[PDB]
Amino acid sequence: IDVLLGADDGSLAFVPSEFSISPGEKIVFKNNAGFPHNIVFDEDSIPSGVDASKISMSEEDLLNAKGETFEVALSNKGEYSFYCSPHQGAGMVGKVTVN
Ligand SMILES: [Cu+2]
């Protein structure tokens, strides 16, 4: 599943921001507009026992180029909340459910 980092109108949003996937399904987060961006899973809002560092950028890491991606596949079932650190208060957040 492809997720844009920044909308095509420049909005600071993940597109889509809420979605569901199955285990091992690739998520490709792709810099689109308004970069740098990152994608950080909130360590307090992911499934039991999951290591956020296996699945996340750090808050200091950035994707700096249009078209640059961060790929991750999730395995454990449940809800995962994530955000772009520099744009979180602007609303650049999302939630993926693994079912
Ligand atoms: Cu951002």
UniProtKB/Swiss-Prot annotation:
MF (Gene Ontology): copper ion binding; electron transporter, transferring electrons from cytochrome b6/f complex of photosystem II activity
UniProt membrane topology term: Peripheral membrane protein
Cofactor notes: The crystal structure with reduced Cu(1+) has also been determined.
Record carries keyword ATP-binding: no
Binding site for Cu cation: H37, C84, H87, M92
Subcellular compartments: Plastid, Chloroplast thylakoid membrane
Keyword entries, A-Z: Chloroplast, Copper, Electron transport, Membrane, Metal-binding, Plastid, Thylakoid, Transit peptide, Transport
Protein role: Participates in electron transfer between P700 and the cytochrome b6-f complex in photosystem I.
Similarity annotation: Belongs to the plastocyanin family.
Protein name as catalogued: Plastocyanin A, chloroplastic
Organism: Populus nigra (Lombardy poplar)
Gene name tied to this protein: PETE
Span within the parent record: 70 to 168 of 168
